[PDB]
Design a protein around this ligand. Sequence first.
Ligand code: YJ9
Length: 216
Amino acid sequence: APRSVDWREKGYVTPVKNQGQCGSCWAFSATGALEGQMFRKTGRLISLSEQNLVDCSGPQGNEGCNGGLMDYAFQYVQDNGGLDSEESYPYEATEESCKYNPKYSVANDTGFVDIPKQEKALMKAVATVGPISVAIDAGHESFLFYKEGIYFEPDCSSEDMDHGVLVVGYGFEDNNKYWLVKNSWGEEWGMGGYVKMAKDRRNHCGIASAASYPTV
Ligand SMILES: *C(=N)C1(NC(=O)[C@@H]2C[C@@H](S(=O)(=O)c3ccccc3Cl)CN2C(=O)C2(c3ccc(C(F)(F)F)cc3)CC2)CC1
């Protein structure tokens, strides 16, 4: 693989969004991964509707503003035959009735791939596929108040993840490697809404434990 990758530089990544006070991190992670794959497929970067996922993917197992899984989101898109644009189905940060309109569908998927649970496998996927949906342990104030540099938390769990985000690349700055991770907490958090998570340090915060992407 390349020594560094940043898919933002290749046009795969929309600006940082803000989930607000709704537990919809999973939906932002999923739209991020699908935005990347649709861009690879068509050459068009189109912002996708998290609200559509929040409101409509209950049958697949998601729980709206109370949490959910990226893979369940990808399954919804496949079952549903589409996903609306952000513009057509704007984000409200509350769970509402499903208002999917196929007229404004701009994305689809044909399934998803779960990446082997190792950082070497994750790097290979990031290098070859595009942005990757990932689960992390974000349940430390050190993450809440993260500002800059490589994030390293001695107490982080590699097995108990509670937050879905998007790996958009990787690189290096003694222990100087990182994953470039797009969050969904607005631009004023971290480095323009991004965090450099410690890479190749024993699967820190479980970043390789539940990584996936949609096929398109
Ligand atoms: C996001 N704002 C917030 N977090 C979640 O919804 C996270 C997202 C995933 S994950 O990325 O943490 C994860 C964890 C383990 C295996 C795979 C993945 Cl993708 C799940 N999750 C959770 O907090 C979680 C959970 C919650 C709901 C469900 C559901 F039943 F399907 F709805 C499954 C799992 C405890 C793990 C804070 C809400």
